[PDB]
């Protein structure tokens, strides 16, 4: 800014930048899909685990 | 910034052609006569210092 | 303000004293003013015309003094006052010229303001003698694996970069400058080569590219670009390496190290030719001036690795010669080849065959060479020289029923050749040169598929950095490969090859 001697636009774009400073807001969208996915996955994982462990001892 | 620097070069060149106009004004004046005397006495001082 | 800077400039003009010797041009043709006056002129003294043109006085004839105009002929005209500046050609030398693109006069052609300099020293200063030098013993790594191993580069020594036209000769050179950033970053003055690139006859478009690449790689802060562009006249072109050398001499005098790259003396030759022929001085072989041998020899002997009495310093040099049709026979190449101590011969065929750097190992030689090779790098690349030598001999055998021995050579040789390819404008640290070559030497790369060599290389390096950057740090700092390191390194290569 101290480079520009025509400064009356650096204050403008500074204020515009600081205005739109939360340019994009927070996202956690993996919290409904991750838990649902975890349930189906967990169910299947434990089933497989128990099955093959059982077979090993058999 | 880029245009600011360009504008500075342009201003300098505007004032350059204005300087040519002032040079023509100076050579118009009988300062053209009076400064010959100034050169003369200055050279007298210079050449005596030799 | 624009007004204030102009006001300072007008204010900075004020008065003068006796113009010691006037001249009046007798005849001006071909940039060869022949002046009547200047009775007490010193040889090659700088003289200032009415037009403000500057000149040198190559011919001091018995009644006329033949000024050579540094400027265009248009500005000078007959009968002009020829003021005698009274100072033989000298250029500011000092420390401030680092990161300043200056022309031969020393005027910043990039407008980086008045030069900060500690002396103005003549550009005709004569080289240090026999006893004022002490033999080379300090490497300069270029970050090009082939250059560093196949033709190791020392300090104060000179080797050609003699090769075919526009094979990006400047690129091979520029790479060296980039590698100097690593050593430069360090604080030790031992580790500081202050490079000077001397752009002779090079088009302003080329110098723009040069400037940007150097700025891009942050190189300007140990770089000086002495610029004598194509447009710049034959006196400037003539004095351009001489001027550059003087800048280097200041660094050398301070006992520091630096690398001055004269690119290309072929255009220097042309300028001397222009001067001599136009001054009607006796012509000579291949229409190059009679004393062209003398010119080139003067420049190239300035480069010196100084003695310890003169507090060992250096001025490493790398002249670039452009061969016209690859003719080493040609008079300007023959002379330079004789004067220099080693040559690196880039070869167009190799460039076309995609080998970049396109250095032809056979026609590259160093007469100082392995004397200033890193000890580690020396150890792991004696083998490399011999293998490539064999690969060359067994090259023609690449047309069926081929002996197992020849086929072994071919596999090893092809992989090595592929390994020595490098993406130009990326230099490679010595601590990463040493591992790659070790692998090749141990022939573990022989197994790796030709297509996969490129992928292998980067992977091996990342693998080494992950696996043991302790080893790498040891290699960097010890600089001498202990049996334990060579052991570990072999293991590491084997392990890496396994993945």
UniProtKB/Swiss-Prot annotation, chain A:
Q: Please indicate which superkingdom the organism of origin belongs to.
A: Eukaryota
- Quote the subcellular location field of this record: Mitochondrion; Mitochondrion inner membrane
Transmembrane regions: none
Segment forming the signal sequence: none
Q: What does this protein do?
A: Mitochondrial membrane ATP synthase (F(1)F(0) ATP synthase or Complex V) produces ATP from ADP in the presence of a proton gradient across the membrane which is generated by electron transport complexes of the respiratory chain. F-type ATPases consist of two structural domains, F(1) - containing the extramembraneous catalytic core, and F(0) - containing the membrane proton channel, linked together by a central stalk and a peripheral stalk. During catalysis, ATP synthesis in the catalytic domain of F(1) is coupled via a rotary mechanism of the central stalk subunits to proton translocation.
- Quaternary form? F-type ATPases have 2 components, CF(1) - the catalytic core - and CF(0) - the membrane proton channel. In yeast, the dimeric form of ATP synthase consists of 17 polypeptides: alpha, beta, gamma, delta, epsilon, 4 (B), 5 (OSCP), 6 (A), 8, 9 (C), d, E (Tim11), f, g, h, i/j and k.
Protein family membership: Belongs to the ATPase d subunit family.
Q: What else is known?
A: Present with 6820 molecules/cell in log phase SD medium.
What is the protein name for this chain? ATP synthase subunit d, mitochondrial
The organism encoding this protein is Saccharomyces cerevisiae (strain ATCC 204508 / S288c)
From Swiss-Prot, chain B:
List where the protein spans the membrane: none
The entry's localization annotation reads:
Mitochondrion; Mitochondrion inner membrane
Alphabetic keyword roster? CF(0), Hydrogen ion transport, Ion transport, Membrane, Mitochondrion, Mitochondrion inner membrane, Phosphoprotein, Transit peptide, Transport
Q: Which GO terms describe its cellular component?
A: mitochondrial inner membrane; mitochondrion; proton-transporting ATP synthase complex
**Single GO term (MF):** proton transmembrane transporter activity
> Is Mitochondrion a UniProt keyword of this protein?
yes
Q: Which domain of life is it from?
A: Eukaryota
Instruction: List GO BP terms, alphabetically.
Output: protein-containing complex assembly; proton motive force-driven ATP synthesis
KW S-adenosyl-L-methionine (keyword) present: no
Q: What does this protein do?
A: Mitochondrial membrane ATP synthase (F(1)F(0) ATP synthase or Complex V) produces ATP from ADP in the presence of a proton gradient across the membrane which is generated by electron transport complexes of the respiratory chain. F-type ATPases consist of two structural domains, F(1) - containing the extramembraneous catalytic core, and F(0) - containing the membrane proton channel, linked together by a central stalk and a peripheral stalk. During catalysis, ATP synthesis in the catalytic domain of F(1) is coupled via a rotary mechanism of the central stalk subunits to proton translocation.
| Misc note | Present with 12900 molecules/cell in log phase SD medium.
Q: How does it assemble?
A: F-type ATPases have 2 components, CF(1) - the catalytic core - and CF(0) - the membrane proton channel. In yeast, the dimeric form of ATP synthase consists of 17 polypeptides: alpha, beta, gamma, delta, epsilon, 4 (B), 5 (OSCP), 6 (A), 8, 9 (C), d, E (Tim11), f, g, h, i/j and k.
Query: Member of which family?
Result: Belongs to the eukaryotic ATPase B chain family.
What name does UniProt use for this protein?
ATP synthase subunit 4, mitochondrial
What species is this protein from?
Saccharomyces cerevisiae (strain ATCC 204508 / S288c) (Baker's yeast)
Residue window of the full protein shown: 193 to 242 of 244
From Swiss-Prot, chain C:
Q: Where does ATP bind?
A: 163-170
Fill in the subunit field for this protein. F-type ATPases have 2 components, CF(1) - the catalytic core - and CF(0) - the membrane proton channel. CF(1) has five subunits: alpha(3), beta(3), gamma(1), delta(1), epsilon(1). CF(0) has three main subunits: a, b and c.
- Carrying Phosphoserine, the residues are 14, 135
Keyword line: ATP synthesis, ATP-binding, CF(1), Hydrogen ion transport, Ion transport, Membrane, Mitochondrion, Mitochondrion inner membrane, Nucleotide-binding, Phosphoprotein, Transit peptide, Transport
Instruction: Supply the SUPFAM superfamilies for this chain.
Output: C-terminal domain of alpha and beta subunits of F1 ATP synthase, N-terminal domain of alpha and beta subunits of F1 ATP synthase, P-loop containing nucleoside triphosphate hydrolases
Q: What is the lineage of its organism?
A: Eukaryota, Fungi, Dikarya, Ascomycota, Saccharomycotina
Keyword Ion transport belongs to the record: yes
Protein name (Swiss-Prot/TrEMBL): ATP synthase subunit alpha, mitochondrial
Q: Does the keyword Plastid apply?
A: no
Tell me where in or outside the cell this protein is found.
Answer: Mitochondrion inner membrane
Originating organism = Saccharomyces cerevisiae (strain ATCC 204508 / S288c)
């Amino acid at each position: 800014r101290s480079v520009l001697k025509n400064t009356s636009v650096i204050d403008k774009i500074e204020s515009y930048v600081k205005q739109y400073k939360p340019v994009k807001i927070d996202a956690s969208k993996q919290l409904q899909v991750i838990e649902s996915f975890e349930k189906h996955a967990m169910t299947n994982a434990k089933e497989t685990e128990s099955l093959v462990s059982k077979e090993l001892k058999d | 910034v880029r245009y600011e620097a360009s504008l500075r070069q342009l201003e300098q060149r505007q004032l350059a052609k204005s300087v040519i106009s002032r040079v023509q004004s100076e050579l118009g004046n009988p300062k053209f006569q009076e400064k010959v005397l100034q050169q003369s006495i200055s050279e007298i001082e210079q050449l005596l210092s030799k | 303000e624009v007004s204030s800077i102009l006001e300072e400039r007008i204010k900075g003009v004020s008065d003068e004293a006796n113009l010691n010797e006037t001249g009046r041009v007798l005849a001006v043709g071909d940039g060869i003013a022949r002046v009547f006056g200047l009775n007490n002129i010193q040889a090659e003294e700088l003289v200032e015309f009415s037009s403000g043109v500057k000149g040198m006085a190559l011919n001091l004839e018995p009644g006329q003094v033949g000024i050579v105009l540094f400027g265009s002929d248009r500005l000078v005209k007959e009968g002009e006052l020829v003021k005698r500046t009274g100072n033989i050609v000298d250029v500011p030398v000092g420390p401030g010229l680092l990161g300043r693109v200056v022309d031969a006069l020393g005027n910043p052609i990039d407008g980086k303001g008045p030069i900060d300099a500690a002396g103005r020293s003549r550009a005709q200063v004569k080289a240090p003698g026999i006893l004022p030098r002490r033999s080379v013993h300090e490497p300069v790594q270029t970050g090009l694996k082939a250059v560093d191993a196949l033709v190791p580069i020392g300090r104060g020594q000179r080797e050609l970069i003699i090769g075919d036209r526009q094979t990006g000769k400047t690129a091979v050179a520029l790479d060296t400058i980039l590698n100097q950033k690593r050593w430069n970053n360090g604080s030790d003055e031992s580790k500081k080569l202050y490079c000077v690139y001397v752009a002779v006859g090079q088009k302003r478009s080329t110098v723009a590219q040069l400037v940007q690449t150097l700025e891009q790689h942050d190189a300007m802060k140990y770089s000086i670009i002495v610029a004598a562009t194509a447009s710049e006249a034959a006196p400037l072109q003539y004095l351009a390496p001489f001027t550059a050398a003087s800048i280097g001499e200041w660094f050398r005098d301070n006992g520091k190290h630096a690398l001055i790259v004269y690119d290309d003396l072929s255009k220097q030759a042309v300028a001397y030719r222009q001067l001599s022929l136009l001054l009607r001085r006796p012509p000579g072989r291949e229409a190059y001036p009679g004393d062209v041998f003398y010119l080139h020899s003067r420049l190239l002997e300035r480069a010196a690795k100084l003695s310890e009495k003169e507090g060992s310093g250096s001025l490493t040099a790398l002249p670039v010669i452009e061969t016209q049709g690859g003719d080493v026979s040609a008079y300007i190449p023959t002379n330079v080849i004789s004067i220099t101590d080693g040559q690196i011969f880039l070869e167009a065929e190799l460039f076309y065959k995609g080998i970049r750097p396109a250095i032809n190992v056979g026609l590259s030689v160093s007469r100082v060479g392995s004397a200033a090779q890193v000890k580690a790098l020396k150890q792991v690349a004696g083998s490399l020289k011999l293998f490539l030598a064999q690969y060359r001999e067994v090259a023609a055998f690449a047309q069926s029923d081929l002996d197992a021995s020849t086929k072994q050579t071919l596999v090893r040789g092809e992989r090595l050749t592929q390994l020595l390819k490098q993406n130009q404008y990326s230099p490679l640290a010595t601590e990463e040169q040493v591992p790659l070559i070790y692998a090749g030497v141990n022939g573990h790369l022989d197994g790796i598929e030709l297509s996969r060599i490129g992928e292998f290389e980067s992977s091996f390096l990342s693998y080494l950095k992950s696996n043991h950057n302790e080893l790498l740090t040891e290699i960097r700092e010890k600089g001498e490969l202990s049996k334990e390191l060579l052991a570990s390194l072999k293991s590491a290569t084997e392990s890496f090859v396994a993945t």
